[PDB]
Design a binder for this molecule. Structure first.
Ligand SMILES: [Zn+2]
Length: 267
C-alpha cells in the first residue's frame, strides 16, 4: 500500500510530502510546539522509526541524536535519507545546519529527497520526479522573490534572536547578527536593556527579529527604552498551532520572512 515515512521536523516533513505526495503517509515526528534543537526520541518513537519504510532527517548537526540511531538501523527495515546529502556546511556558532532558510538551498534538499526516494523505490520514480518538479517550480519563484527583493539592499545587516539565517545571508549577500540572551517572552534586566540600547544606538539598528512574535511587554520595552522595533523571522523549525490552523506552509512563511526582512534591508 502506501509507504510509511517518518520525518523529523517541519521542513523535512514538508519537502518529503511534496516529493512523495500520495505514494506515502508522511508522519511528522517533532510537531508543533516542541523545539527540534532539544528533542530526542523516546524508545517507542525510536521503534516507530525502525519499522518505518523510510526515515528522513535534516542533518546530524541538527538532529544530533541521529548518529547513535543510525548504528542500530542495519538490523531494522527502515531506509534513511539525510535531506542535506553532501551539501557543504558553514561552521557552527559544530556545523550550522540551518540551510532550509535559503530558498535556493531548499531546492537542493528537495532534489536530494527525490533522488534518494527514487533509488529506494524505483517503481515510483516517475511520481517522485513529477511531484518534485512541480514543487521546485514554486521554490524557484520564491528564490526569485528573495533575489529581487534583497539584491539591492541598502542595509546589509540584520539582527536576529535565533541564528538560523546564516545561509540566507550567505546566499543573498547579507550579514546576520545574532543576539543571545533575548527570548520573545523575556523581560530583560535593566543592565541587559542598557547593553541592547547601546548596541542599537551605536549600530543604527531598526529592528530586532524574533523566531516568534515578541510579547507585547517585550515589544513595548524595546520601543520605549531601546528605540528599536520588533518583527518575526521564523526559522521554520516548528509551526505554531495557530499557524498550522491557518494553513501556513514553508513557502508562505518564507514570504512573510522576506517581507519582515525588507523592513530592515530596504532602509
Ligand atoms: Zn535553529
Amino acid at each position: 500500500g502506501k509507504l510509511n515515512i517518518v520525518t523529523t521536523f517541519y521542513p523535512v516533513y514538508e519537502f518529503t510530502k511534496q516529493v512523495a505526495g500520495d505514494t506515502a503517509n508522511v508522519e511528522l515526528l517533532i510537531g508543533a510546539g516542541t523545539e527540534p534543537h532539544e528533542y530526542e526520541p523516546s524508545a517507542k518513537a525510536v521503534a516507530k522509526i525502525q519499522d518505518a519504510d523510510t526515515f528522513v532527517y535534516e542533518n546530524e548537526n541538527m538532529e544530533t541524536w541521529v548518529p547513535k540511531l543510525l548504528d542500530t538501523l542495519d538490523k531494522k527495515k527502515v531506509k534513511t535519507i539525510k535531506a542535506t546529502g553532501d551539501m557543504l556546511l558553514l561552521p557552527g556558532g559544530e556545523f550550522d545546519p540551518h540551510v532550509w532558510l535559503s530558498p535556493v538551498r531548499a531546492i537542493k534538499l528537495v532534489e536530494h529527497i527525490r533522488d534518494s526516494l527514487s533509488a529506494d523505490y524505483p517503481d515510483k520514480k516517475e511520481t517522485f520526479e513529477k511531484n518534485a518538479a512541480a514543487y521546485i517550480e514554486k521554490l524557484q519563484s520564491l528564490d526569485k522573490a528573495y533575489a529581487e527583493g534583497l539584491s539591492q539592499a541598502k542595509q546589509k545587516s540584520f539582527v536576529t534572536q535565533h541564528a538560523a539565517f546564516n545561509y540566507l545571508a550567505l546566499d543573498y549577500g547579507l550579514k546576520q547578527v545574532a543576539i543571545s540572551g533575548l527570548s520573545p517572552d523575556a523581560e530583560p534586566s535593566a543592565a541587559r536593556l542598557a547593553e541592547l540600547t547601546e548596541y542599537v544606538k551605536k549600530n543604527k539598528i531598526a529592528y530586532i527579529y524574533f523566531e516568534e512574535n515578541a510579547s507585547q511587554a517585550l515589544a513595548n520595552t524595546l520601543s520605549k527604552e531601546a528605540g528599536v522595533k520588533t518583527d518575526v523571522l521564523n526559522p521554520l523549525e516548528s509551526l505554531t498551532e495557530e499557524d498550522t490552523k491557518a494553513g501556513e506552509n514553508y513557502i508562505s512563511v518564507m514570504e512573510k520572512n522576506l517581507k519582515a526582512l525588507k523592513q530592515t534591508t530596504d532602509q
